[PDB]
Symmetry: D2
Subunit: 334 residues, 4 copies
Amino acid sequence: VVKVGINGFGRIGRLAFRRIQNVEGVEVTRINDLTDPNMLAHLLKYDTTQGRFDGTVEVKEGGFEVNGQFVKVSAEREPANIDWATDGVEIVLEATGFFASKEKAEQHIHENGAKKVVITAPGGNDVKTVVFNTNHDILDGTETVISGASCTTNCLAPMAKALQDNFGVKQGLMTTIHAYTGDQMILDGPHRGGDLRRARAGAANIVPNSTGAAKAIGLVIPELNGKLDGAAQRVPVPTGSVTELVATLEKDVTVEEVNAAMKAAANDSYGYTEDPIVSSDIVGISYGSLFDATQTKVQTVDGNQLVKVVSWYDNEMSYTSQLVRTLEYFAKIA
Amino acid sequence: VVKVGINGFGRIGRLAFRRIQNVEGVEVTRINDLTDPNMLAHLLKYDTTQGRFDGTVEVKEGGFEVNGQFVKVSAEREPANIDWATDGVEIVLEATGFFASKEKAEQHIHENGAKKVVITAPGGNDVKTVVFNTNHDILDGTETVISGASCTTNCLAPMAKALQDNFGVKQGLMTTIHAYTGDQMILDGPHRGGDLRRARAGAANIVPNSTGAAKAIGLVIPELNGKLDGAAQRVPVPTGSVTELVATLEKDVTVEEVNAAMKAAANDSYGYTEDPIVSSDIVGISYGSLFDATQTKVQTVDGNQLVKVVSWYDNEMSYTSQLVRTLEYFAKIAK
Amino acid sequence: VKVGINGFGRIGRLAFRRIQNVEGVEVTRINDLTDPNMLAHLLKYDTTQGRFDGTVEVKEGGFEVNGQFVKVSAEREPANIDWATDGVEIVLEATGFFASKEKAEQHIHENGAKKVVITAPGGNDVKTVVFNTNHDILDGTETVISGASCTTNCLAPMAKALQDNFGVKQGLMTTIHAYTGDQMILDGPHRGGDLRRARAGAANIVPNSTGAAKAIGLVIPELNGKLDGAAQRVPVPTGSVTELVATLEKDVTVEEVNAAMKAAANDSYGYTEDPIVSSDIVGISYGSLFDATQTKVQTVDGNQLVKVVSWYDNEMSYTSQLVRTLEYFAKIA
Amino acid sequence: VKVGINGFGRIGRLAFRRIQNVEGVEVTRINDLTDPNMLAHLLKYDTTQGRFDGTVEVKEGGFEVNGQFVKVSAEREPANIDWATDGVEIVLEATGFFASKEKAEQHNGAKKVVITAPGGNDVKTVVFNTNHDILDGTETVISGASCTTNCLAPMAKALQDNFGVKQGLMTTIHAYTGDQMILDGPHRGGDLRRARAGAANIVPNSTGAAKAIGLVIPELNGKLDGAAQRVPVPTGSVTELVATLEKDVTVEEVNAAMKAAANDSYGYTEDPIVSSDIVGISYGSLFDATQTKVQTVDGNQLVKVVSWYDNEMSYTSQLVRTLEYFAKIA
Ligand SMILES: NC(=O)c1ccc[n+]([C@@H]2O[C@H](COP(=O)([O-])OP(=O)(O)OC[C@H]3O[C@@H](n4cnc5c(N)ncnc54)[C@H](O)[C@@H]3O)[C@@H](O)[C@H]2O)c1
Ligand SMILES: NC(=O)c1ccc[n+]([C@@H]2O[C@H](COP(=O)([O-])OP(=O)(O)OC[C@H]3O[C@@H](n4cnc5c(N)ncnc54)[C@H](O)[C@@H]3O)[C@@H](O)[C@H]2O)c1
Ligand SMILES: NC(=O)c1ccc[n+]([C@@H]2O[C@H](COP(=O)([O-])OP(=O)(O)OC[C@H]3O[C@@H](n4cnc5c(N)ncnc54)[C@H](O)[C@@H]3O)[C@@H](O)[C@H]2O)c1
Ligand SMILES: NC(=O)c1ccc[n+]([C@@H]2O[C@H](COP(=O)([O-])OP(=O)(O)OC[C@H]3O[C@@H](n4cnc5c(N)ncnc54)[C@H](O)[C@@H]3O)[C@@H](O)[C@H]2O)c1
Ligand SMILES: [Mg+2]
Ligand SMILES: [Mg+2]
Ligand SMILES: [Mg+2]
Ligand SMILES: [Mg+2]
């Protein structure tokens, strides 16, 4: 049983905690955030988009009990000052959004701190970046800091990989139509990151925004390095997203071939569907990516093809499911 | 002064009426819908997304007065039974969504009916389809039924045209991230048109849906016939939309060239901006299409280019502005 | 007991879902205005209530749910539905269009159904049941009964508890309520002539009428004529809350009021002290969930106004009550 | 009179907009926590209140509005803002963080401060056209009260003057605001409800408006209490008051009394409007006669009265009325 610590008990932190309850041999013994146990316990119990917690939660001194079992809560602002080892913690899920680099994540690793760190976000080009079931084979267990990549990367990767392996990808442009997130303002106001679009009311607008997922795909699928770019449209749903990829391929294809190739690539991480679903239908799913064969296009004009492939993801639970798969596997080979 | 009738006093019908108040050559003397004048007057006065009506509205017997001037209201379900001529109406705006074809729209044209019809939607391949300032020159005035095209078509057309004229378009795929509309269900329920996605709660989902705008662009820009296809993602804003086009071109280009070409093509119908705006910023605009230079991409990989161009539109007011431009012009030249 | 659903809508579909976990009641026929593919899809996927717990496969003239076939018809007139063909004794009338004794009775003819449960208020000549508040008024001989409204099932146990413990003189109710299918998605002509329900339901606070308080006498006779109220419809797709401001026959404290509600708690009436919000009550099985955090007792110059507040999922809370009433009725029929 | 804005937020920016159409009041300095580009962009484009009516051009250390330069600073501490450099006599304190006499007084600084929120019991609290007569101009710190107080006050006052109020309970069905989280997360103020996704929930929350009404209408002191239900609209609110009165009344009498009390601050309507219809209005409070109830049971009456307000523009309109008047008598 590997003992895990969560830094940043936010959307990803709390959902990771929920999934970990059904993973034998991984257990959370410590949570660090910037608030009291009552706030954190309440947010675990009740969840607007992901439903009521499946179990009991009872606030205690310095923490809370989940199904009888105590979990320590601290409010330490600096990772360097978190004494993870006190609670037996070997691996930290770094889920704050503020320490997503090798140098900053490593602050968790000190005397009486943690041994290893999994960043719940892109962590820079000097940190191994893992999409479970696409490139988790790059791990040997000696790594001190790893990255679970982004929500959009975990969605895009198996879809793009399948295209590459089957047909060959020349280039592609991606658009993600994406749920609003906590880095957007609830109402028009000064954005601390200087983004004039994330400054705007997130639940009342279509909001264009940048994403590096397509550009950084090379870190996950080397052979696609430099081939993909993209962007996002943030829209008023509180969770649930979809990724469209328009690509040129090395082989002529049909819609049926493309869909069949995706179905053949399906596994625990990459789902396949032919039902005409909408975003609420993918909230809480455990696939990292859910290919939607109903949205496939292959456009042939004067012998030239553009291919459109589309995959759903719950930017919350889909990512978290992938994250916990990567955490479990990493813990077992550490 | 050409007298106009509105069939379907809905989102497009009511907004068209609003714009017509500031058009000298044209006036609405009759509205036909499926309800009483009180309902229609209230909906004209108060508008969730487009604001309070600029003027006075007072309910009367068989109609209502707008700034003193009476407008007749009928509730006739069948276009054949609407006596448009009684109120001097020559041209009907067919805005119900139920008579969007040549055969069905022509029902307005009978003895004591109207002379001509403008469909506020695609109207089939046998009806001239107009995007104002892109192909309104195809009109000679002898037409009995014309189409103002769709919201997405009026957005896409000047953007695509500019790409064609400057660089040449080989092919392209379009996605419109689009406001929910009245053909979607407020909550999950049986959809009358058999669409399993429009059956879903429109203000609580990202909803994929089909659109023929890209496929039917040939009707507006003949040289793009067969070159474009696309689809929609309907999302929870009550109005305001954006169209992304990913295309291959006949010339190698840069981002700066593409943006400069759009700016050079700008007019009353096609706007240009470099401000990082969001959808609420385009609600109520009078451009049919507002090109956003901040979203342009030109991706070069192994010498091959994909070009991404993006334009905003208020599916309500942008379209309506184009519609009324087309109506005004058509009314001037009508024979 | 074999059951038929007329109107496979929000309440119809959710009732079907709950019935899967009720032994001895089963749905053998659905009637609506569409094809089986539309209905099966809507059962499988649900924006506010989640993916269906089971398998659904479309067939000719119906669909299979966990292997078991359910017939689908598209008959517009209740008189023309041959319920008896599929063994149906009791019809859930869930369309919203036949909510009266005379209209509901159209289901009852020779190869039709025997009995009808209207999923809405059904008039003063139809017994109106809020399960665990007045289901004892049923003897099983009734041909048409009413499961009341969402707001009535929320209000009733809360008001009853006030009456039994302290005595109610009078009260005014406000329900802050999810938007529903009778509102327009965007501003447009409303078929019922309501100038407020004509407005975009997911983009406005929309005042609207409700008869729940006024009709409470049908459920709790001793409160007849004592309560009135209204609604504010707001942009959540499901989930509602009922506030009642009342004068009572006894002086009280906040703690007494809350303790009385807790003592009245059962399968239909829940009690909570957690500061929850509407998403937390989506899908609950209580008809009414009293929220002790929102209680007020205001004393000014010796006079008291008492505020009590209860949550309800206008969808699942009501449906849970409806199916409790259906199950019980079916047992004693 | 030259004015400074501390906190260029929803109220700050909207106050700036209204001030453009007030002769003899002018904003020469803005202080916030960001660069001029961010502030200029937020002035230009507004999700709920529309595009700015004029030109805005970013400059070094500020921006130009219709040609006229406005200085922007990013000073976190009010004590360190050199307001006097830009001629500023009166500061609109609109951050939400300095809403007390001691904290507001921290403002070569300014002479006087108007807090855009309740400011404590030792600060004069003004609802324009209800109690602005309490000002003599010698005050250093004043309060424009809250959005809900400006809505409730003229409605309650009218009830008191006409019929007499014994007691009442208020519910405001209120737009979500910036103090709520966009998605479920730790709330810095310790509020377990404001922690929740504001645009995806009905969220109960406290409000002191009813309890503090005594500061505006002394004769109602101790008579009113209430609470809020925050709901998913980005602006626009409504206040319901259920009250017992000293006189027996009818619905028609109550409505007629409200109509008779109508002025620039207190509007009257009989149209069955919804919240989008009141976005951007200039009334502090808009009485809705369609929602009135008078319930008589065994000779005893409960009276329900309801008024709309744009928590943003209705409040701001009142705030700028109070600012203008205060500036003139200072
Ligand atoms: N939400 C998503 O869709 C999503 C998907 C994939 C990846 N991510 C990534 O996960 C990370 C967190 O995102 P989120 O959506 O959960 O954010 P969130 O705001 O919900 O949660 C962040 C949490 O971190 C806490 N925090 C902030 N600073 C801290 C500090 N110094 N010490 C301890 N705790 C601190 C906050 O109090 C908060 O509880 C980010 O890196 C984000 O990019 C998010
Ligand atoms: N809303 C948009 O974004 C948009 C944009 C471009 C084009 N359009 C098109 O405009 C048309 C109307 O769209 P809308 O969004 O205004 O719809 P809407 O539903 O708001 O209005 C349609 C109106 O027609 C009325 N109606 C229905 N059947 C009728 C009949 N038989 N006779 C008379 N009136 C009848 C209804 O009462 C309703 O008021 C459609 O063809 C639509 O595709 C809409
Ligand atoms: N949604 C709620 O919160 C709620 C709560 C309590 C009670 N109710 C009541 O339940 C009833 C239905 O409400 P809903 O929200 O489920 O409505 P809904 O619109 O979701 O469902 C109504 C269904 O009836 C069908 N229908 C309409 N006319 C028909 C006909 N002639 N024959 C057969 N089917 C027909 C429609 O196709 C639709 O599927 C109403 O009486 C309503 O007041 C609703
Ligand atoms: N929005 C409403 O409906 C409403 C109505 C009435 C009153 N108010 C009150 O107005 C005040 C502001 O409310 P808002 O909704 O505009 O908030 P907001 O968050 O929109 O604006 C606050 C602004 O102040 C800035 N700020 C924060 N700390 C600062 C500091 N130390 N120095 C300088 N600037 C700082 C922020 O960057 C932001 O631009 C609060 O007191 C609030 O209670 C709000
Ligand atoms: Mg475990
Ligand atoms: Mg005119
Ligand atoms: Mg069963
Ligand atoms: Mg001025």
